Amino acid sequence: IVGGYTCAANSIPYQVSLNSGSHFCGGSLINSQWVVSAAHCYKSRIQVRLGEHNIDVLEGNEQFINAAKIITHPNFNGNTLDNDIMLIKLSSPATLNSRVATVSLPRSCAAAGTECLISGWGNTKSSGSSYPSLLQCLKAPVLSDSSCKSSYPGQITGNMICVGFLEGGKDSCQGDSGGPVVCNGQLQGIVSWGYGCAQKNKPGVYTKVCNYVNWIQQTIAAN
Ligand SMILES: [Ca+2]
Ligand code: NA
């Protein structure tokens, strides 16, 4: 997250870290047994780390649980990044408490201008790289479907939204990938793609979660 702030410890209790030797992507706890993330985050081995604030130190609220099943959307396209969504089944259920909690799926798609919270352990530098120990947070609005489409001519499908700021300086980045965009208590976005991060007139592009509630519920029911 470029241009954000350090979240309060455990204030984003649905945020997970996907680990394979080190942190590589975010995800969101949506059921005791399921995490949703980005298909471009796919790896064949993943350990989900729940209840994190400092990914570099054990603080006592963590639950480390290996992925049992990893299911990319069957229409994921790695070129256009259409359908950039992935489900992870936990090998044992997460234990839900104040520090590890589910986030609601969308009841509806979000209006343009809806305020959201974007979080993760991605790059914090707009020039160079610095990967934080501590979970970063960003307040950002859903941009007009228009203002999204002007930024990326012919590249915004019906399954994508832009969230952020056209002036630059505030965005998700590499390593925030797969993480949450939560707007009025609903998971509306998954960190997906862009053109670098925090650049002028290049807002983050997010998987539009309100198109996927059927696919998510069907996939959970089937496994
Ligand atoms: Ca920790
Ligand atoms: Na971006």
UniProtKB/Swiss-Prot annotation:
It catalyses: Preferential cleavage: Arg-|-Xaa, Lys-|-Xaa. Residues 1-221 form the Peptidase S1 domain. Its cofactor is Ca(2+). Its main location: secreted. Signal peptide: none annotated. Ca(2+) binds at residues 52, 54, 57, 62. It is found in: Secreted, Extracellular space. It comes from the Eukaryota. Disulfide bonds join 7-137, 25-41, 109-210, 116-183, 148-162, 173-197. Keywords: Calcium, Digestion, Disulfide bond, Hydrolase, Metal-binding, Protease, Secreted, Serine protease, Zymogen. Its EC number is 3.4.21.4. The active site is at residues 40, 84, 177. One of its GO terms (molecular function) is serine-type endopeptidase activity. The record marks 171 as: Required for specificity. Pfam families: Trypsin (PF00089). This is Trypsin. It comes from Sus scrofa.
